[PDB]
Amino acid sequence: MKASRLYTLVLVLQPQRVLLGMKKRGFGAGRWNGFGGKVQEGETIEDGARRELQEESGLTVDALHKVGQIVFEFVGEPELMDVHVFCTDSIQGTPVESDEMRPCWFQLDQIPFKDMWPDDSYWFPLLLQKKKFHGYFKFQGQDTILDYTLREVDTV
Template sequence: MSLGRAVRTGLAYNNRCYHSFPGAMYTTKLFTLVLVVQPQRVLLGMKKRGFGAGLWNGFGGKVQPGESIEEAARRELLEESGLTVSTLQKMGQITFEFVGNSELMEVHIFRADDFHGEPTESDEMRPQWFQLDEVPFSRMWADDIYWFPLVLQKKLFRGYFKFQGQDTILEHTLKEVEEV
């Protein structure tokens, strides 16, 4: 497939998707995010370095070439928390746009209710359990408060968030769906 065809159709090419909008062309990079949930609590990680440093988040990262989205989710969870999971439930997909950046982030969000191992700090993340009524939304990405409750309620969703910088949401859409 030629790159030109990928641009016109929005298809994947070399683990990236290409989209053409009037006046602009965006590439989309694939990411994963895993939330480990147990009755009355959720495991989050304090991001220690890189994009989103200083914020609590789920565990995840970039999908590598030749890797499926679910394989990437499992790998990132293990690398960042020391945990493995038997089952991942795909809960949602959100596209993020950051003003001034021509690369969109397509994040595939998973939920894991069972895991193996003990949460262990890594170079990138410091894991900590939070009671569901004490989730630190004020120290998380601004969009989390919109979709995070859907994951906890086991509702499937798709969304789009446009950010100015890392703190300000300029616009967003979020809808529950039958399948992701």
């Protein structure tokens, strides 16, 4: 059995558009994604998600709703990444580029899947349907999935 490290991921999903950020450096650089990062000691997972959203996108939200959890495993890495996925539809400021991320809105018929992590093609459609999910993906490097599981759930 492996140890896991906690991460968050936040999608601002509105009726006709979703906010993504182009990751400018670090893990997943070059891919559009939601905002997020490592959970810190002492904070709830939701509050860590709110913190990362503010730090990486400039947006400050009162609350986030948990929609999924995805575990990532990489060949050659002993530690799993346990990613807790949150949404909101409700914002009240403008996104601001950070060192981590350049925010950009996408219409919901223009989700840039080819420039997102490959696994997002599987779970993002459930997020768009307002379904809840648990997933697991094993990667060789950045591009190749060797094994995965995905399930819709009623409670995350």
